[PDB]
A = this chain, B = another copy of it.
Amino acid sequence: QRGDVIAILQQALETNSFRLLFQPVISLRGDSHENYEVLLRLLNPQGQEVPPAEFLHAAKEAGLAEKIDRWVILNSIKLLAEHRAKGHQTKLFVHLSSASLQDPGLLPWLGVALKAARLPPESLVFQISEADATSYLKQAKQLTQGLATLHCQAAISQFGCSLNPFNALKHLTVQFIKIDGSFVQDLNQVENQEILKGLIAELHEQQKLSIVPFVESASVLATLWQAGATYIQGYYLQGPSQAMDYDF
């Protein structure tokens, strides 16, 4: 039970052997939109099961990651056109890797891609880890302006771990801030409640829309109400499915 996972990814792109899942994002302060996060899984060569963490790790590798990011975008748009066509007012969050964020030719590739899609506006929100972009701050700035231009949105995920996390946002064009898992633990404790309240209040003072992930029970879901959260995500609401079939 083993294999070169690089080669497996390279030969998965070669053959379009991937799938996309959709994990809805749920509005606590109104949004007409159907928001889903796009997640990626690998269709395994027949016997082999590539463990997810090892898969994701491999797919961050420079020059594999760009190709992969592009497959997701491309196919994300393809499906997104099939879907909205149904009259559906839908919006997809897509991940971008560190590599992609660095890749000067991305906004170009994306423009041409989006034309061929005749894709509705403000339907794509691009998502960047706070680490990738606290690091590549200038490339993230170029990219998020670039993205406004195309009538696209942008989000920082895993927000609030870094030193002074509000600083990087003075420099970006992002509407959403998906808070880090670490803030959504042991919420039954006040200090953790309070910590999450303040974090969320400051994002609101900065006119960002907060997204709180990892809602794993009904209770936490209440605390996120009084905390001010704008959106939530998790398995208690819905897990990642092959279809954008959530009843909002």
Q: Which residues of A contact B (CB under 8 A)?
A: 1-7, 48-54, 57-58, 60-62, 181, 184-186, 214, 216-218, 234-241
Contact = CB atoms under 8 A, between A and B. Distances in A.
Kindly list the 4 A-B residue pairs having the minimum CB-CB distance in the complex, ordered from nearest.
A5-B216, A1-B239, A6-B217, A58-B216
Nearest to A52: B52
A186 B61 CA distance: 6
Given A1-B240, A6-B217, 18 more contacts: A1-B235, A1-B241, A2-B236, A2-B239, A4-B236, A5-B217, A5-B235, A5-B236, A6-B216, A51-B240, A57-B184, A57-B185, A57-B214, A57-B216, A58-B216, A60-B185, A61-B186, A62-B186
A237 B58 CA distance: 14
B51 A235 contact: yes
A237 B95 CA distance: 29
Contacts of A181: 57
Contacts of A238: 1-2
A184 B6 CA distance: 13
Contacts of A48: 239
16 contacts: A1-B235, A1-B239, A2-B235, A2-B237, A2-B239, A4-B216, A4-B218, A4-B236, A5-B216, A49-B239, A50-B235, A52-B53, A54-B214, A54-B216, A57-B185, A58-B217
A217 to B, nearest CB: 4
A238 to B, nearest CB: 5
Contacts of A237: 2
Contacts of A4: 216-218, 236
Nearest to A1: B239
Nearest to A187: B61
A9 to B, nearest CB: 9
